[model samples]
Target: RICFNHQGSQPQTTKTCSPGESSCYNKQWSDFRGTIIERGCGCPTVKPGIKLSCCESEVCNN
Candidate 1:
């Protein structure tokens, strides 16, 4: 998945695998390089059939 929203709004992406199905991600509310995702702490499964588990949840807006 790839996304780029040149400040025009309307740009979200989502990708998840099926099985034990796990993907409850959130990020990209500006300052993506500064950082702001410290609340619960979760970043599991980056391997094993790899469906993506990090990179700040890939990308999202909704």
Candidate 2:
């Protein structure tokens, strides 16, 4: 789970991860002034077909 929209324009940011969790997220937004930014990290899961992943590059904007 992940969310975005941070910087200008009200408060819009969210992140939720629990129950055998794993997470990694990033974000950035800018609508010609209406701005936003985000970052994330999470971990919880040990062995037995472990699989969880999230990644971004170049400051993350999408």
Candidate 3:
């Protein structure tokens, strides 16, 4: 599977994934560097209930 590593097409940066790492998720951050986007694969179980907009379609994070 593939997903955007950074920006989207919306012009995105892409990353190819390994098996069992097909999940694509999008989350936004408002920080000191200003607003940013977080989009990637292999959705980790990092803690519980961290909200992210996710999809299972190719290049769908845009």
Candidate 4:
């Protein structure tokens, strides 16, 4: 699966997740600097106050 991949303080890019284990993930939160967004290929366990989402389609997390 293809999805938008972006990390903290970095540029946006694309990630091609594995065939069977593929999934798109997006993380969002608000800090002193305002909104922070992170995207990747897998769902991650995070703390409270952070919003997390996982999608199964191409660029679904974009």
Candidate with best lDDT: 4
**Sort by TM-score, top down from the best:** 4, 3, 2, 1
Cα deviation at 6, candidate 2, in Å, is: 8.2
Whole-model lDDT values for every prediction: 0.34, 0.41, 0.70, 0.82
Give one digit per residue, the lDDT tens place, for model 2 in 1-62. 44232433445554544444445444444556654444544432333533333453322322
Q: How accurate is candidate 2 locally (lDDT)?
A: 0.41
Error of 2 at 61 (Å): 14
Query: Which consecutive 10 residues in model 3 have the weakest lDDT in total?
Result: 42-51
Encode model 3's per-residue lDDT on 3-49: one tens digit a residue.
88885235668888887665787877565776666788866554453
Among these predictions, the greatest TM-score belongs to: 4
TM-scores of the candidates are 0.25, 0.30, 0.68, 0.75
lDDT of 1 at 25: 35
After superposing candidate 3 on the true structure, give the runs of residues whose Cα lies further than 4 Å from its correct spot. 8-11, 45-51
Model 2 residue 40 distance off true place after TM-score fit, in angstroms: 4.0
| Per-model tally of clashing residue pairs | 0, 1, 3, 0
Q: Looking at model 4, which ten-residue stretch has the lowest summed lDDT?
A: 6-15
Candidate 1 positional error at 44, Å: 2.2
Per-residue CA lDDT of model 1 for 1-62, tens digit only, reads: 32222232334433444434333433333353643432112345344432332333323423
lDDT of 1 at 12: 40
**Candidate 4, overall lDDT?**
0.82
Clashing pairs in 1: none
